[PDB]
Amino acid sequence: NDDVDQSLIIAARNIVRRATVSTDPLASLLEMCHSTQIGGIRMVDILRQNPTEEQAVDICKAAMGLRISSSFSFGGFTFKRTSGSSVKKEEEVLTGNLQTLKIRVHEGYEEFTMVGRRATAILRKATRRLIQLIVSGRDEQSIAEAIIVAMVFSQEDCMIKAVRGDLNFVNRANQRLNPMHQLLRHFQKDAKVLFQNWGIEPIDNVMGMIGILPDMTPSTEMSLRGVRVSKMGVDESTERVVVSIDRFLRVRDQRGNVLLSPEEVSETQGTERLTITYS
Amino acid sequence: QVQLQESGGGLVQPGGSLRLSCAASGFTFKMYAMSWVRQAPGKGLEWVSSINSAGGSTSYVDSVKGRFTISRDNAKNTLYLQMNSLKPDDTAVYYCVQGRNWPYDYRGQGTQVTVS
């Protein structure tokens, strides 16, 4: 039932945002899940029976003790690992503005599918190195957004070096974002320096693929290094797992990896077709 | 000889409705996903909605979700966009395109929509 799903997402996004501005976001969220109705039905009743996987919806499901997808969200993209492992090593790095940054680096090859609402990609990477990104998407901005996420996730020093101011991004409670989301917010604001300094390479013009230049125009001849746009589309089930959620709505899998947080919830939403009554 | 021709734009008031049409020709329409994209004042080409070949599965940008409905009549080689609860920010030239992946090789001439 897609009207319910879409109304559920809208309600869930609104609730997660409001619960973020409190001394106990988990407690606030749960209260709001219990006090909110959609089409005249309590949200908890819908969450318990609705299969939608969306970041705010899954934060609410975790708060209620319900299983969600085992995939993590970064930059709005659901990352499903298809190779390599999760083990990471801390490193202090230095941005292009001479600000230090403590990041957690996986060593060794990994491979992911990135599934977004407006783009899909295959990401192959090694230690602090983008090997390949193959991305398809609905429009130029949506592909650019996937490319930015993938460059940040790569943790390549070219990307750290392209940072051009101090990084003091916060959430809705004015609490500072973690290092990778600092980097994500910076380049989401303006990616020109990152794209211009990343590097380009000649491409083999092959059917269904096209290059993409640092100014985000398609090219048959060159492309951002390691990046290709799929005109035919990248292909893409849900493993549902028991999760935990802490006071600040950070959701973790059994091994302690963070899957979701309020920072992974879209800032936009549709228009509900079922009436949502809050409180 | 792929040809796309949009129809149905106009000047309307907030809260109003319009129905865009796009007649396709020069390809087997039934075998292609189709999309609507738009160019609002000051901006680039932004995707609005996609629909698969059979018509059963649809996708929308958040800003139109719950207000716009994409549909298609494969018998008549026509793509539609029902725009309800129109807002000033829906002002744009609306284009029909083949497929659902950017960059779009085939785009119509556009139909202007102005909500004021």
UniProtKB/TrEMBL annotation, chain A:
Gene Ontology cellular component list: host cell mitochondrion; host cell nucleus; virion component
GO MF, one annotated term: RNA-directed RNA polymerase activity
Keyword Disulfide bond: no
Species: Influenza A virus (A/duck/Fujian/13/2002(H5N1))
Subunit field text: Influenza RNA polymerase is composed of three subunits: PB1, PB2 and PA. Interacts (via N-terminus) with PB1 (via C-terminus). Interacts with nucleoprotein NP (via N-terminus).
A biological-process GO annotation: viral RNA genome replication
Name of the featured protein: Polymerase basic protein 2
Entry's localization field: Host mitochondrion; Virion; Host nucleus
Free-text function comment from the UniProt entry: Plays an essential role in transcription initiation and cap-stealing mechanism, in which cellular capped pre-mRNAs are used to generate primers for viral transcription. Recognizes and binds the 7-methylguanosine-containing cap of the target pre-RNA which is subsequently cleaved after 10-13 nucleotides by the viral protein PA. Plays a role in the initiation of the viral genome replication and modulates the activity of the ribonucleoprotein (RNP) complex.
Keyword entries, A-Z: Cap snatching, Eukaryotic host gene expression shutoff by virus, Eukaryotic host transcription shutoff by virus, Host gene expression shutoff by virus, Host nucleus, Host-virus interaction, Inhibition of host RNA polymerase II by virus, mRNA capping, mRNA processing, Viral transcription, Virion
Polymerase basic protein 2 helical domain boundaries: 1-68
